[PDB]
Amino acid sequence: PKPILYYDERSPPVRSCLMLIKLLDIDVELRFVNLFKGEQFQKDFLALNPQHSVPTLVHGDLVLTDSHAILIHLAEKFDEGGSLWPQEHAERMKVLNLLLFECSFLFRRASDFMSAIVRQGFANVDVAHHERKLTEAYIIMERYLENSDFMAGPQLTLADLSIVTTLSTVNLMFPLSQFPRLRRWFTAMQQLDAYEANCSGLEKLRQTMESVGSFQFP
Amino acid sequence: PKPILYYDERSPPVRSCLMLIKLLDIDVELRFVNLFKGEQFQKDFLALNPQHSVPTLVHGDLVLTDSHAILIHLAEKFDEGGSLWPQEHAERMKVLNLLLFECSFLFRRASDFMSAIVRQGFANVDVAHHERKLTEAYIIMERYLENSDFMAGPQLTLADLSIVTTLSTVNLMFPLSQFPRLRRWFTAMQQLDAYEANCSGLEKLRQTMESVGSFQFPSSSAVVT
């Protein structure tokens, strides 16, 4: 059976998988789960994924509930011998390391910020606090780009697909003008054919956040 | 060359790597970084790992800055063909899925809770809020263990090593009375010879948190075997 992707394109990790699917021409069945209507708490989805999160991939009997596992799985199954998920161990571990940075550092802080807006309202969020936390992530990625054109080396990898969607989401609020390597990389990422898979969900998140948060991004 | 592990044993992710090293009898050079004294912000360590986090592994030219990558790299180099990081693709993806659960959900919430204690003092923390968010992680792990004997399947894997350390950390505060599968699984993990590598740093984290947070964990919560 072809893979089934439960998704809401406002989620940046969803968009990372949509970019990989477009990049590799994967035939996938999309199933929309509206996160802002709480559809991730519907009994059948909770039974499928008790973490009530998207993306969720069902591929045969395999149920994956984290975008980084989905990216790796789809690359191994549909891009064997490719460069997005390098076959050499040291290069593959460097891509793994940056995928985990995205999960544990960049996305955690992006989620902390966006969730604060939803819960407290934009007017009541400590914006300076989150600006510092996310600017630190900008600084780290700027250092990661010192020796290489991409996040994990000289070529595009799953690490770039995972990072770019969250960064574009944080970039809604905090510009990249003070980070030259990072701004050039982000501009280069926007030139990919596959980057088109990010545009629609980013704009939907922009307008959903502005309405729910009762504000407007700069 | 031999792997270098920058560590603070109070970190649950550090203890996860310490358990794998003991389970596999890997010779590693331990280099201590005191998280509570702020040695992770020293110039030399920041240059090596700008995320200023432990565990950090240096193995030859490879520098890993996340425990889950470290567990996978060590399993592939010292448990080739083993069952901790299984060779069959579907089983391996299941282990990876649970490692990312630990990173994105259990550890995220456990760190939110401990961080608040350190920053505000226990008496100013909204403990009920964190009790809810961590009980939800308990429920999810209980669900995983209803369908399988270990976290990712019928055998011990890297997912159990990653999860048990943060679980033991959360369980300093929140009891497991209502979670029989989690209790049975935790009890089994504590019988493992490798679990000795978790014991010491758990206790030191208990002592440090009580001091910095100006409180005491309820002694009745922690599961002891």
Author numbering:
A (entry chain BA): 4 to 221
B (entry chain AA): 4 to 228
Kindly provide excerpts from the paper associated with this entry:
The importance of the Asp-113–EST hydrogen bond for EST binding was biochemically examined with a recombinant mutated DmNobo protein carrying D113A amino acid substitution (DmNobo D113A). DmNobo D113A lacks the sidechain carboxyl group at position 113 and therefore cannot form a hydrogen bond with EST. The crystal structure of the DmNobo D113A did not show significant structural differences compared with the WT DmNobo (DmNobo WT) protein. In the absence of EST, both DmNobo WT and DmNobo D113A showed GSH conjugation activity although the activity of DmNobo D113A decreased by approximately half of DmNobo WT. In the presence of EST, as expected from the EST-binding to the H-site, the enzymatic activity of DmNobo WT was inhibited with an IC50 value of ∼2.3 μm. In contrast, the enzymatic activity of DmNobo D113A was not inhibited by EST, even at a concentration of 25 μm. In contrast, it was barely possible to determine the Kd value between DmNobo D113A and EST because of a weak interaction, which was consistent with crystal structure analysis.
Here, we report the first crystal structure of an ecdysteroidogenic regulator encoded by the Halloween gene, noppera-bo (nobo). nobo encodes a member of the epsilon class of cytosolic GSH S-transferases (GST, EC 2.5.1.18; hereafter GSTEs). DmNobo forms a polypeptide homodimer with a canonical GST fold, which has a well-conserved GSH-binding site (G-site) and a hydrophobic substrate-binding pocket (H-site) adjacent to the G-site. Consistent with the requirement of GSH for GST function, a defect in GSH biosynthesis in D. melanogaster also leads to larval lethality, which is partly rescued by the administration of 20E or cholesterol. These data indicate that the nobo family of GSTs is essential for ecdysteroid biosynthesis by regulating cholesterol trafficking and/or metabolism. In general, GSTs catalyze various reactions with an activated glutathione (GSH) molecule in the following three ways: GSH conjugation to a substrate, reduction of a substrate using GSH, and isomerization.
